Design an enzyme around this catalytic site. Sequence first.
Site, PDB file in Angstrom:
ATOM      1  N   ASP A 145     -28.524 -26.402 -50.226  1.00 18.16           N
ATOM      2  CA  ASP A 145     -28.186 -26.861 -51.600  1.00 18.16           C
ATOM      3  C   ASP A 145     -26.917 -26.150 -52.066  1.00 18.16           C
ATOM      4  O   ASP A 145     -26.896 -25.675 -53.206  1.00 18.16           O
ATOM      5  CB  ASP A 145     -29.352 -26.652 -52.573  1.00 18.16           C
ATOM      6  CG  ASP A 145     -29.134 -27.271 -53.946  1.00 18.16           C
ATOM      7  OD1 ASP A 145     -28.086 -27.911 -54.151  1.00 18.16           O
ATOM      8  OD2 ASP A 145     -30.017 -27.117 -54.804  1.00 18.16           O
ATOM      9  N   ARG A 149     -23.006 -24.972 -58.868  1.00 19.88           N
ATOM     10  CA  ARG A 149     -24.100 -24.426 -59.719  1.00 19.88           C
ATOM     11  C   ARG A 149     -24.800 -23.260 -58.992  1.00 19.88           C
ATOM     12  O   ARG A 149     -25.352 -22.379 -59.683  1.00 19.88           O
ATOM     13  CB  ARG A 149     -25.089 -25.536 -60.108  1.00 19.88           C
ATOM     14  CG  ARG A 149     -25.941 -26.038 -58.947  1.00 19.88           C
ATOM     15  CD  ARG A 149     -27.061 -27.011 -59.293  1.00 19.88           C
ATOM     16  NE  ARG A 149     -27.470 -27.718 -58.080  1.00 19.88           N
ATOM     17  CZ  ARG A 149     -26.834 -28.772 -57.558  1.00 19.88           C
ATOM     18  NH1 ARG A 149     -25.776 -29.281 -58.168  1.00 19.88           N
ATOM     19  NH2 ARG A 149     -27.260 -29.319 -56.432  1.00 19.88           N
ATOM     20  N   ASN A 150     -24.810 -23.255 -57.654  1.00 20.16           N
ATOM     21  CA  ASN A 150     -25.473 -22.204 -56.838  1.00 20.16           C
ATOM     22  C   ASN A 150     -24.413 -21.234 -56.296  1.00 20.16           C
ATOM     23  O   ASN A 150     -24.661 -20.601 -55.251  1.00 20.16           O
ATOM     24  CB  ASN A 150     -26.320 -22.805 -55.711  1.00 20.16           C
ATOM     25  CG  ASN A 150     -27.515 -23.590 -56.211  1.00 20.16           C
ATOM     26  OD1 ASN A 150     -28.234 -23.137 -57.095  1.00 20.16           O
ATOM     27  ND2 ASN A 150     -27.728 -24.780 -55.671  1.00 20.16           N
ATOM     28  N   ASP A 163     -29.249 -18.031 -54.109  1.00 15.02           N
ATOM     29  CA  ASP A 163     -30.457 -18.806 -53.729  1.00 15.02           C
ATOM     30  C   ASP A 163     -30.428 -19.237 -52.257  1.00 15.02           C
ATOM     31  O   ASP A 163     -30.957 -20.317 -51.968  1.00 15.02           O
ATOM     32  CB  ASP A 163     -30.574 -20.020 -54.651  1.00 15.02           C
ATOM     33  CG  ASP A 163     -31.090 -19.648 -56.023  1.00 15.02           C
ATOM     34  OD1 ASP A 163     -31.116 -18.437 -56.329  1.00 15.02           O
ATOM     35  OD2 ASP A 163     -31.479 -20.571 -56.764  1.00 15.02           O
TER      36      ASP A 163
HETATM   37  C1  LIG Z   1     -25.420  -9.956 -65.185  1.00 12.73           C
HETATM   38  C2  LIG Z   1     -25.462 -10.408 -66.599  1.00 12.73           C
HETATM   39  C3  LIG Z   1     -25.776 -11.807 -66.979  1.00 12.73           C
HETATM   40  O1  LIG Z   1     -26.315 -12.092 -68.053  1.00 12.73           O
HETATM   41  N1  LIG Z   1     -25.431 -12.741 -66.069  1.00 12.73           N
HETATM   42  C4  LIG Z   1     -25.603 -14.140 -66.150  1.00 12.73           C
HETATM   43  C5  LIG Z   1     -25.641 -14.808 -67.384  1.00 12.73           C
HETATM   44  C6  LIG Z   1     -25.815 -16.172 -67.402  1.00 12.73           C
HETATM   45  F1  LIG Z   1     -25.846 -16.810 -68.604  1.00 12.73           F
HETATM   46  C7  LIG Z   1     -25.953 -16.921 -66.256  1.00 12.73           C
HETATM   47  C8  LIG Z   1     -25.919 -16.274 -65.038  1.00 12.73           C
HETATM   48 CL1  LIG Z   1     -26.080 -17.208 -63.584  1.00 12.73          CL
HETATM   49  C9  LIG Z   1     -25.748 -14.890 -64.973  1.00 12.73           C
HETATM   50  N2  LIG Z   1     -25.720 -14.234 -63.725  1.00 12.73           N
HETATM   51  C10 LIG Z   1     -26.718 -14.079 -62.816  1.00 12.73           C
HETATM   52  N3  LIG Z   1     -27.921 -14.625 -63.097  1.00 12.73           N
HETATM   53  C11 LIG Z   1     -28.877 -14.476 -62.180  1.00 12.73           C
HETATM   54  C12 LIG Z   1     -28.641 -13.797 -61.000  1.00 12.73           C
HETATM   55  O2  LIG Z   1     -29.602 -13.616 -60.033  1.00 12.73           O
HETATM   56  C13 LIG Z   1     -30.616 -14.617 -59.846  1.00 12.73           C
HETATM   57  C14 LIG Z   1     -31.125 -14.517 -58.433  1.00 12.73           C
HETATM   58  C15 LIG Z   1     -30.360 -14.981 -57.364  1.00 12.73           C
HETATM   59 CL2  LIG Z   1     -28.825 -15.721 -57.681  1.00 12.73          CL
HETATM   60  C16 LIG Z   1     -30.805 -14.870 -56.047  1.00 12.73           C
HETATM   61  O3  LIG Z   1     -30.018 -15.360 -55.046  1.00 12.73           O
HETATM   62  C17 LIG Z   1     -29.899 -14.604 -53.845  1.00 12.73           C
HETATM   63  C18 LIG Z   1     -32.042 -14.305 -55.791  1.00 12.73           C
HETATM   64  C19 LIG Z   1     -32.818 -13.822 -56.834  1.00 12.73           C
HETATM   65  O4  LIG Z   1     -34.032 -13.227 -56.649  1.00 12.73           O
HETATM   66  C20 LIG Z   1     -34.564 -13.178 -55.327  1.00 12.73           C
HETATM   67  C21 LIG Z   1     -32.355 -13.929 -58.143  1.00 12.73           C
HETATM   68 CL3  LIG Z   1     -33.338 -13.303 -59.426  1.00 12.73          CL
HETATM   69  C22 LIG Z   1     -27.387 -13.264 -60.789  1.00 12.73           C
HETATM   70  N4  LIG Z   1     -26.413 -13.397 -61.692  1.00 12.73           N
END
Ligand SMILES: *CCC(=O)Nc1cc(F)cc(Cl)c1Nc1ncc(OCc2c(Cl)c(OC)cc(OC)c2Cl)cn1
Length: 270
Positions: A145, A149-150, A163
């Site tokens: 995917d 967006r990812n 992801d």
């Molecule tokens: C860092 C501060 C912040 O608020 N960042 C924001 C704000 C926002 F409005 C949207 C986003 Cl996308 C972000 N950044 C952000 N959000 C989530 C994140 O991690 C989620 C996540 C991912 Cl991407 C993966 O991929 C490997 C795995 C896991 O858990 C296994 C999670 Cl929780 C990163 N950055």
Amino acid sequence: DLPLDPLWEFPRDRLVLGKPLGEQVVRAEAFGMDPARPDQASTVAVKMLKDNASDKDLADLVSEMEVMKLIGRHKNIINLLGVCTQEGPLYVIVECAAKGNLREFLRARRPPSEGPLSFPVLVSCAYQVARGMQYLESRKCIHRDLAARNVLVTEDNVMKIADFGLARGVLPVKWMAPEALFDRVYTHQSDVWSFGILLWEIFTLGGSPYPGIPVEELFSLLREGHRMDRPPHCPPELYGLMRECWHAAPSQRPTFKQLVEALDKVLLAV
Ligand SMILES: *CCC(=O)Nc1cc(F)cc(Cl)c1Nc1ncc(OCc2c(Cl)c(OC)cc(OC)c2Cl)cn1
């Protein structure tokens, strides 16, 4: 329940959870993600289960944690930082990219005129995602995917693929290679198709693919050898890359190695 992995366990008492990011994933402050300066705080993201999660929901989160451990780290992926497995709920801690996902990043930097996103910077975004994908490929990870967006964007405009470790948990037809759409076959080559779509997203500043064309008509448009047109300002060399990604035959598309080399040559030429 879960065994203590000495290489990843992080003290539960040294993570202060904050604002939710979506429903769960939570913004947190971790104290001591740098062993060198272990008083130093950093902002991270924490995946955890909500109260009405099943045994299968636990299994899927364990599986994502274990997959991220094994793939290892890279500049251009959202990295695992640590886990809380013991005497409390399962937390998986990862990097938090300050500027959100690549789609919203580009859409907010649309000029009314010239915008603060130069050609070199846009090629740089594409190159960084190609580097990320070449790494995941070398660790035998098929994303399935890949889309703007990812892809998340750090405070220093570094691209990090999100992801890349999901199990079977919640289709984006427009990003899928034909062999995926029709035969449910996902390969590295099908990810190359999705990369081509993402290239187009970058050079439309987060445009929606196949503008106005109902999902019903996409299948027959692709079988007829039709593809998205060159976006307004996109140089031909870049459209040419997109087109190569959209060859019907997967073996005809570029490898992530070849995409990295191609985008490298554009940035060197600048
Ligand atoms: C860092 C501060 C912040 O608020 N960042 C924001 C704000 C926002 F409005 C949207 C986003 Cl996308 C972000 N950044 C952000 N959000 C989530 C994140 O991690 C989620 C996540 C991912 Cl991407 C993966 O991929 C490997 C795995 C896991 O858990 C296994 C999670 Cl929780 C990163 N950055």
